[PDB]
Structure 1
Amino acid sequence: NLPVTVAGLGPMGSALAAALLDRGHDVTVWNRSPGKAAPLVAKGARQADDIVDAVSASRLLVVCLADDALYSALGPAREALRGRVVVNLNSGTPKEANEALRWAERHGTGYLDGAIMVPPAMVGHPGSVFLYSGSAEVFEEYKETLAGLGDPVHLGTEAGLAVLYNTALLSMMYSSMNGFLHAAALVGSAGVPAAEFTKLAVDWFLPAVIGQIIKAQAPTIDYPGDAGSLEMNVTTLKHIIGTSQEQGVDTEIPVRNKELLDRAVAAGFGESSYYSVIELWR
C-alpha cells in the first residue's frame, strides 16, 4: 500500500524509486526517456504511459529531475495535481524552491522541498538523511513514507530553507575536503601512509578539535576553549606555509587562508576573535 509516484529516473531518481520498492510501496515511475524505467519495472514498479496517469496513481509525488524541468514535466498534468503533494528533491537555489512552491500552490498541490544529503547508493539505508522544508502538516502526513528514503529532518515551513541549508553545508564540505587534501599531501610528502593519517584526522581531529573549536568560536554557543587571537593564527599559518615550502607541497591553500586572516586583522585587531573573519563576507 502507500502508493507513491517518482518522476525522474536519473541515478538519484532511480535510487529513490528502488528504495521505495524495497520498503514495499506501490511505486509508479515516470521519466522523459522511456529507457530508464525498465530496471524499475523489473523490480515491481508500474511505468506510467503519461504524466496524468503517473500523477493520478498516487497522492504523493516525489520529483527528482535535472533542475525548470519541473514545470515542463508535470505541467501537462493540470487538474490532476489538485489535492496531491509534490516532494521536490532537486532544487538549485532558494529562489527556485520558492518558484516551485508558487507553481505547486497555483495548482492546488501541497509542496515540500527536500535536500538529499547522501549519494544515491546510500538512499534507503541507515545513515541516509534528507532535509525538508515546507508545510508542517504535509510533512507530518508523509513523514512515515519519507522515512523510507532517509531520516527526515524538517527545518521549518518556508520552501527555500532546505536548499539554503544544503548549499551552506556543502560549502563547508568542499572547504574541509580541500584542507584535508592539503594535509594529506603534506604528510604524504614525507612518506607517511595515508590511511592511518586519514583515520587520525577524521576519527579524532575532526570532531575533537575542529568541531569543538567551531563551537568555541560561535558567539552563541557556550571546552575552554578558543582558536586564539587572529595574530596568533597568522603566525600558525606562516609555519604551515614554511612547512609546505620545505616539503615541496603547493602553498596555495595555506597562503589563501593566511591572506584572509590578514584582511580580518586589518579590519579589526590582531586581538579580534577568529569568528570575526565572517564579517568580511556580510
Structure 2
Amino acid sequence: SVTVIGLGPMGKAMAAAFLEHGYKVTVWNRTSNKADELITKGAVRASTVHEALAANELVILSLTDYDAMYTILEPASENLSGKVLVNLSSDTPDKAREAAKWLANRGAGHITGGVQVPPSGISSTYYSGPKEVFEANKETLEVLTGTDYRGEDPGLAALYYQIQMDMFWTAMLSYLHATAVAQANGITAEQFLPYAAETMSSLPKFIEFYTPRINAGEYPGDVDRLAMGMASVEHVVHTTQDAGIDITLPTAVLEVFRRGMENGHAGNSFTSLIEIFKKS
C-alpha cells in the first residue's frame, strides 16, 4: 500500500510507522545493502527500483540529496508514469522545482515535503505541489507527521524548511558562541542554561511585536533605537575579544548594524536592518 526509498534515518523511521498500520510496504536502498530487519514485518524488498516502483502508486523518497534521485530513477523512468512520488528532501527551492518538472515529464504525480523534525519526530511537515494530489494522499501522510500544505509551487516546502534552518543554525551558533564566552569567564554551560533558555524563549514576544510593523515596511524607533542597538553590539564584540573568543560571528552582526547606521536609520528601529538584508 506504500513504498519507501532510502532506508536511512527518516527512511526506516518512516518505514517502521508504515508497517505498523497495514500497508503492503516495499523498500529499497541506494547502496543496495539488505537492511534485513524491516523485511521481518511485512516488507518486500525488490532487486531493483523497477519493481519497487511498480509495487505501489505511492512512493516516498528519503534520499541524501536530489542528485541521487535522478541517478536511480532514470533507469526506471518508463515506470514512474502514473505514480505519486512524495519527495522528502532538505534541498533548495530551485532543486525541488527542477525535480518536480522532471517527474511530471514522466507522467508522475509529485509532492514536495519539508520534514521539520529528526527521525525521532516520526510534529509537522511542509508540503507543496499540485493541490489535488496532496489532498488525495493526505491521510496516508498524516501517519508520518502532521501535514502543513503551503501551496502550489513545488519549491515552497523546501523554502519554508530553509528559512527555518536559517534561524536555527544562526541562533544555535550564537548560543555556542555565548557559551564559549561564558566558560572563558568561569561560568559553566550548566549554570548558563536557564539564562540561554529565557533569552531564546523571549524572542517570540519580540517577533509578534515587530511583525506587523515589518509587514508594513515601517521602522519607527518608539521602543528601540538602531544606534543603541549598535552600541550594544559593540559591547558584545569587545566582551568577546577580552575573553579571547573568536569574534567573526558577532562582527558579522556588527557589520549589518554599521550599514544600517550609514543608510540613515540611526533613529529608526533596529528592525530597519531588514532593508539592509534586501540590499538597499
TM-score, normalised by the number of residues in structure 1: 0.87
Letter in 1 for 2:167: M
> How far apart are residue 215 of structure 1 and its match?
2.8
Q: How does 1:78-227 map to 2 (within 5 A)?
A: 78-90=77-89, 92-120=91-119, 122-124=120-122, 128-202=123-197, 204-208=198-202, 210-218=203-211, 219-220=214-215
SS at the partner of 1:169?
helix
Aligned equivalents of 2:114 and 2:222: distance in 1? 33
Residue 220 of structure 1 and its aligned partner are, at CA, apart by: 2.6
Deviations 1:66-113 (A, max 9, x none): 222222322333343222200001252222211221122112211101
**2:19 matched to which residue of 1?**
21
Q: Which amino acid aligns with 1:265?
A: M
Matched, 1:242 2:241: no
Letter in 2 for 1:141: A
Measured at CA, do residues 69 and 255 of structure 1 come closer, stay the same or move farther in structure 2, by a change above 3 Å? closer
Query: Residue 91 of structure 1 contacts residue 97 of structure 1 at CA under 8 Å; is this kept in 2?
Result: no
> How far off its partner does 1:34 sit?
2.5
Relative distance call for 1:101 and 1:251 in structure 2 (3 A) is: closer
Contact 1:230 1:273 in 2 (8 A): yes
Q: 1:193 to 1:17 in 2, by over 3 A?
A: same
Which residue in the other structure is 2:55 paired with?
57
CA deviation after TM superposition for structure 1 residue 248, in Å: 3.7
Pair 1:72–1:251, CA change in 2 (3 A): closer
Cα offset for 1:214?
2.6
Counterparts of 2:72 and 2:222, CA distance in 1: 51
Alpha-carbon distance, 1:163 to partner: 0.8
Question: Which secondary structure does the structure 2 equivalent of 1:35 belong to?
Answer: coil
SS at match of 1:167: helix
Letter of the structure 2 residue corresponding to residue 275 of structure 1 = T
The DSSP-based 3-state class of the residue aligned with 2:52 is helix
Q: Does the C-alpha gap of structure 1 residues 241 and 160 become closer, same or farther in structure 2, counting only changes over 3 Å? A: same
Q: Quote how far apart the aligned CAs of 1:154 are.
A: 0.8
Q: C-alpha distance in 1, partners of 2:232/2:137?
A: 50
Q: Paired residue for 1:255?
A: 251
Q: Is the Cα–Cα contact under 8 Å of residues 8 and 65 in structure 1 kept in the other structure?
A: yes
1:45 aligns to 2:43 (yes or no): yes
How far does residue 244 in structure 1 lie from its aligned partner after superposition? 2.7
- For 1:72 and 1:201, the matched residues in 2 are separated by 44
1:170/1:54 Cα in 2 relative to 1: closer, same or farther (>3 Å)?
Answer: same
Q: Which amino acid aligns with 1:161?
A: L
| 1:132 Cα offset (Å) | 0.8
- In 1, are the aligned partners of 2:265 and 2:272 still within 8 Å (CA)? no
Q: CA deviation at 1:17?
A: 1.6
2:66 maps to 1:71: no
Shift of 1:241: 2.6
Q: Counterpart amino acid of 1:251?
A: I
Alpha-carbon spacing, 1:229–1:117, altered in 2? closer, same or farther (3 Å): same
Q: Secondary structure at the match of 1:76?
A: coil
Moved more, 243-252 or 47-56: 243-252
Query: 5+ residue gaps in structure 1?
Result: none
What TM-score results when the alignment is normalised by the length of structure 2? 0.87
Q: Could you tell me whether the CA contact under 8 Å between 1:89 and 1:116 is conserved in 2?
A: yes
Identity %: 39
RMSD: 2.3
Which AA in structure 2 matches 1:270?
A: A
